Write a protein that binds this ligand. Sequence first.
Ligand code: LMT
Ligand code: LMT
Ligand code: LMT
Ligand code: LMT
Ligand code: DGT
Ligand code: MG
Lengths: 99, 120, 98, 320, 49, 345, 19, 459
Amino acid sequence: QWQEDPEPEDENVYAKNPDFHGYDSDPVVDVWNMRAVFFFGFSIVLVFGTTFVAYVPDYRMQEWARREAERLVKYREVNGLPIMESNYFDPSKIQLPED
Amino acid sequence: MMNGRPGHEPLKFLPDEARSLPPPKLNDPRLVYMGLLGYCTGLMDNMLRMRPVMRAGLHRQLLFVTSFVFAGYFYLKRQNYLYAVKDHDMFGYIKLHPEDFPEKEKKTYAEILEPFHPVR
Amino acid sequence: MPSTFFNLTMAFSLSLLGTLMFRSHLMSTLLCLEGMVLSLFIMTSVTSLNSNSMSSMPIPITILVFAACEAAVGLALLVKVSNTYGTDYVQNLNLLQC
Amino acid sequence: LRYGLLAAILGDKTTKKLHEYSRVITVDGNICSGKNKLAKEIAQQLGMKHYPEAGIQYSSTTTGDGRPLDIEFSGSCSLEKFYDDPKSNDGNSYRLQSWLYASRLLQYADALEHLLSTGQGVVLERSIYSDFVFLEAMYNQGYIRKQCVDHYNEIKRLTLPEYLPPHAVIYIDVPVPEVQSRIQKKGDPHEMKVTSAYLQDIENAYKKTFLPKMSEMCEVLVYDSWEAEDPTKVVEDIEYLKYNKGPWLKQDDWTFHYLRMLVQDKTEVLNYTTIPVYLPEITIGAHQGSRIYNSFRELPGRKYAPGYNAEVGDKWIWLK
Amino acid sequence: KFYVREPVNAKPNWLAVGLSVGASVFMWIYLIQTHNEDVLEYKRRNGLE
Amino acid sequence: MNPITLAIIYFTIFLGPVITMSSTNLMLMWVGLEFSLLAIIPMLINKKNPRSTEAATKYFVTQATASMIILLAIVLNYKQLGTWMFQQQTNGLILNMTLMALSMKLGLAPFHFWLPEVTQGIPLHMGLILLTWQKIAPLSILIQIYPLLNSTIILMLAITSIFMGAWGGLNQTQMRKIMAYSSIAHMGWMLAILPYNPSLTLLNLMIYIILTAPMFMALMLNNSMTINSISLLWNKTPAMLTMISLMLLSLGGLPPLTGFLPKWIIITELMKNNCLIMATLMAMMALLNLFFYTRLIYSTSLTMFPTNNNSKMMTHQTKTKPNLMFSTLAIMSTMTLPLAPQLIT
Amino acid sequence: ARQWQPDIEWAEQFSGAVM
Amino acid sequence: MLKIILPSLMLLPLTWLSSPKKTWTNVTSYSFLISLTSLTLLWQTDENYKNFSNMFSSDPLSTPLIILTAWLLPLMLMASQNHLKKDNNVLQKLYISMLISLQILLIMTFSATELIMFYILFEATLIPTLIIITRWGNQTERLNAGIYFLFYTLIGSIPLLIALILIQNHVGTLNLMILSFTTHTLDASWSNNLLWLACMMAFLIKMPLYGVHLWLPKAHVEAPIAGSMILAAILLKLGSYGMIRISIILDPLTKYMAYPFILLSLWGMIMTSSICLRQTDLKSLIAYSSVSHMALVIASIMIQTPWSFMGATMLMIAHGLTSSLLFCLANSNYERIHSRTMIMARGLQMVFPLMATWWLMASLANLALPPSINLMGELFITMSLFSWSNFTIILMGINIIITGMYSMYMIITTQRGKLTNHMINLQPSHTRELTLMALHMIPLILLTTSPKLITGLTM
Ligand SMILES: CCCCCCCCCCCCO[C@@H]1O[C@H](CO)[C@@H](O[C@H]2O[C@H](CO)[C@@H](O)[C@H](O)[C@H]2O)[C@H](O)[C@H]1O
Ligand SMILES: CCCCCCCCCCCCO[C@@H]1O[C@H](CO)[C@@H](O[C@H]2O[C@H](CO)[C@@H](O)[C@H](O)[C@H]2O)[C@H](O)[C@H]1O
Ligand SMILES: CCCCCCCCCCCCO[C@@H]1O[C@H](CO)[C@@H](O[C@H]2O[C@H](CO)[C@@H](O)[C@H](O)[C@H]2O)[C@H](O)[C@H]1O
Ligand SMILES: CCCCCCCCCCCCO[C@@H]1O[C@H](CO)[C@@H](O[C@H]2O[C@H](CO)[C@@H](O)[C@H](O)[C@H]2O)[C@H](O)[C@H]1O
Ligand SMILES: Nc1nc2c(ncn2[C@H]2C[C@H](O)[C@@H](COP(=O)(O)OP(=O)(O)OP(=O)(O)O)O2)c(=O)[nH]1
Ligand SMILES: [Mg+2]
């Protein structure tokens, strides 16, 4: 046979450090890696990112569009105009082919 | 394509007519990137010689950064000049041949009948 | 002139065909190269004479000078081939297929 | 200025330095034949540099801080293990012999570099030229496989012809029954386990192969024990050798330049000892190979090139 | 002393260091000066300020 | 070699191409090519074994034959027009044999068969000169007569070289043969664009050279002649694993490396001239090169092959190589695509 | 289990004259 | 975008200049903060898309893909730590640099305004991806997986390069906005039909389309976990994102050119989902599940309706989080018993009760339980396809049945039944592992709360 190491044995991570969090074999490094993930991942990103998204105003002008629609529905109805016409473009602005 | 053009000096890196162009900024992003490559070259050289990558030979590292920026500035000046000459020739040729480059009067979309292709 | 230059070009073509179609001796091929050189010398010389181009007569001499250097190197290489194998056969020169 | 073509052109030339005792001398013989005491006195009396026999740790002691290394860094082979079980199925016998050939090759390049650069002669104890007598003895005793022999002869074919052989080869002839007695008096627990058949193979290889081969190109001087015990007698024979044969006669300044270029570059010297021929005895898997290599670069003075190890007191790194 | 053999890089190559810093410091000065004249000539030729 | 011989021979190796690139007269261009052949032979055969003798001999007979055909074209043109340069009026057959003979000098397929054999038979540092410095003089001639060349022969030579460079490199375990097939493939790209845009021929030549030079230096560091030898890098000089991998991927033309630029720009220019079918075929078969480079990357840096016991003695030794030219070329051959506009015009 | 790395049988497929 | 890209580039020196004991804590924390900054792209108070410069833009299609990319980097780092803890310090830093490189390349890819820039970054991603798979994969088949992945992509990408050059030679630009406004109808020539295929094949291979999908099951089974996460979550979405960008110039040929690819996808999604019923390898099962889901994305992009594009955008994001979660869940058992055979570990709810809860939610997400964005995307795709042809519901209906079958099959097999009690090395779940699962599942729930953010361009 060639010169090769034997396969390493299975290890129980909790045997030496029963407070293991999954991050590091050094206990102090382990707990601070755990805290950084929970603080930056959850306390900062998930809470404040959620807050910031929640207070983005008029996202994609959805609030303006409903406000504008009510203004037009109001206007188009008191004056007796149709609510919505078939032609988006006024036909006077279009020159069709003679044929 | 441009080599045989009028007033072409042989093996001239920077013709005197190039001195009318604005020179590149010394913090031009292309020159900043050149200096970064010189810094990488110094670090890679340290690695290949089994030296401390960041610590060894700061004099050697500084020369690598300065050479890349120094060479890059003058090469960038030459490249600016060649592109300027290309535009000078192209536009000058356009003016001498107005029959090959007519101004095409474009029509508004009120007159153009594009076909409609229903999606369904 | 017309028929002479046709025959000289044919003479070059035959010498090149000799070069391209090996037999066994490397030396026989080295002689075919000297045949192409000889044909090209006469073609250049006759052209210079027929056009009275005296400023071009150095060129045929330079053709022979570099041909002599080419032939000297060819013979020098042939000594090396013969030392390795005891012949100048080209079929022995096949180690670099693998 | 590191030696090279420029230094050679500027006067640095070997033939100006050679004198009467700018010679390569090797001392051979069976185990416990008295080579070391003789080699030491030949070198001392002639003003030459003595190189003790290249062992397992030779490379360890000529690099770094010169201290011995852990064995996994140094060939992972054991002479004591060889005597305890010369047929171990872990490949120790040939791994040992292969390592010792490469360590001898390194020493021979180091000795030649010394002679070529200074003009002082050298005295060796066995060499790459005589290393095969141990390989033949192992094979004849069935200690190694034939494929191990073919591997060894390939590496030797690729490395040994590049060098100049010794000027003089000194052989001490001690018969095997006397060699066994000296080993028992020597008192090494494992070496005492060496069979007499193994020692006879060494002597057979020495006298049928090495000595006739060496006599074609070197001065050969054979002594019995009683002649060798007085080293001044051997020196007197060396002083009057003529050296009228071999390759050293046709060396000139530029063949010496190119040999010097080879022997100062140690990774070039050792190149063909590492050819990828996958003999199990000397093949290391990547898991073991990389674990060992990573630990070696964590030893003191070994993480960086010499002169760049701040933890062993190297200074001015930022200007080097 | 640590190394059994003397390193090649035991102490700085003081000539090499001085040439390197001299070459870099000269190139930086020449680069900045040449850039200054390149600006003035550009402005002069184009009638700017 | 003693210093006087080295100086004279290396000077003549340098001189020949300089004469070719500076000459107005076609005869002096041919003289320049003659200097190159004569001066390189002693370097090819310097080590003096049967393989180097075979390599030098095969190189000599090919190169000398091609040189005669080039001279025939020059003489025929002198007969036709009474001048020593090719013109618009030069007979097209005269120009086609010039192209044939120069492509044989370059090792373009189907005149390629000699080049992998000669590269295999010579030292690595001579392979470096053969595949870089020795290309410049024949290419320089071709660039001068680019409007006169026949696009049909060029594209057929070009596609043939790319196809055989690809399939050729796929079967190799010898490094010197892999580089030779890499040369042939890249020459196929250089030639394809020459009749359209000779500036892009030079762009490809420069990028090929600064990729090939540090690749040869990396082989030279441990004298790695085979895949199995280069696969020991992880144990001998692991610091090189990053740059070899990127240089190999750059040679294969993978973005965002500098070696993507020559293939990208040549395709762009070929399609500005409606050479769509050839450009498609060229680009598709160039992927086969990336396959054998990847297999090479697999055996050097992405896995670890078995090592041997004697390699531990190598780890005790200090090295003095590579020179700092390796790092400069290695970086500029891989990380300069952001500066692409400054390289094409 | 340990990461697989090339063994002798894997490396020997590049030891031939051709692939 | 520079205020997102530059800090991402600074993660590379941060990795290499950190102490060995601080590298993971450092790079993970700033990676989270960079995800926070990418949320600025969601501040969209009008209907004009953000054009930051000539080079970088962001609209409602790229913005979700950029943010998901930014979020994955911290998650991949946490996923990698345990199986890298035996590598030496330089090898760990090299791995982190590969992960950062993909994050940088992908963010630039989704914000590029010009198609050849997209192509260069699109192709650049193969390098770090291949390195991750082959240098840190566990089995000997990782090398074959690398070859398939690299060359399935490359053979399709070369025709794409030709088409992009051809379009630029004809139009004078590859800028996306100008291509949109100035697009003109194509003629239905053979030459234009080949142009359509050259523009589409690389994106279709990347999805992957059924028939050319064999690279993906190979790549997942052999990759390390962070490679599986990025591949399933983001890299497949390059094809769908590419198809949506480039199809604007291909009209009206997509009306007939799409038929073979709708057929392969709608039939193929049944073949690959049915494979999941008889797959012995858990990673392979999750991988085939992705091919089935991405078949729906292909079909809805091919029919080019407002609903179909919106359903595809939601499914792209939802699948990204869900599949990445499933790979992480599978990897947690593998790190304990070092096998991917699904039927080996059993009854795991007995010993990992909270991890079993994460399993159930991931499975419920995968079979598209309402009102999850998983269901919302699949629902609107179903509505658009039914409009395209009412008979599509037959194939949709079969896939919905099969998807429930294999989703619950995976849960029953691995979490329920009797515990395989010879496995005494079933260590309790790591805090890191349980945190990793939550970081997938909270965004899925939050996006279900506010589904306007992932509707895409058409709604
Ligand atoms: C993502 C995380 C986001 C964190 C959010 C933190 C937001 C903090 C909210 C601060 C809101 C109060 O903001 C403050 O309100 C006052 C109301 O008096 C307003 O102030 C304005 O109107 C008031 C009306 O009386 C005037 O008197 C005043 O002079 C004028 O400036 C402005 O809007 C602002 O000055
Ligand atoms: C390589 C590039 C750099 C070097 C540039 C070239 C110039 C080199 C100058 C130094 C050359 C002197 O090199 C010297 O050459 C002479 C040739 O007469 C050789 O000498 C030769 O003639 C002398 C006669 O007395 C004898 O040594 C002998 O018959 C023969 O070898 C030397 O052995 C060699 O040392
Ligand atoms: C302005 C005029 C310019 C003149 C031309 C300039 C040419 C410059 C190139 C000089 C190159 C010399 O390159 C150097 O040459 C020597 C011998 O000469 C090569 O050869 C040396 O090393 C190899 C390594 O195996 C040995 O096999 C060989 O026997 C030994 O001589 C080196 O490997 C190379 O590093
Ligand atoms: C567009 C994105 C660009 C991606 C850039 C690609 C980065 C380079 C990828 C190739 C990686 C180089 O290959 C990698 O080299 C390093 C050393 O540097 C080796 O590193 C490892 O092994 C070597 C010995 O072999 C040890 O000395 C070293 O400490 C250890 O970390 C890796 O095992 C190898 O896989
Ligand atoms: N297997 C093997 N053993 C070797 C080799 N060279 C030396 N040895 C062993 C044999 C001995 O047991 C041991 C001591 O070396 P020696 O042969 O020189 O014996 P010793 O030094 O005691 O007597 P000496 O004065 O030097 O002649 O080293 C070798 O090449 N192969
Ligand atoms: Mg002894």
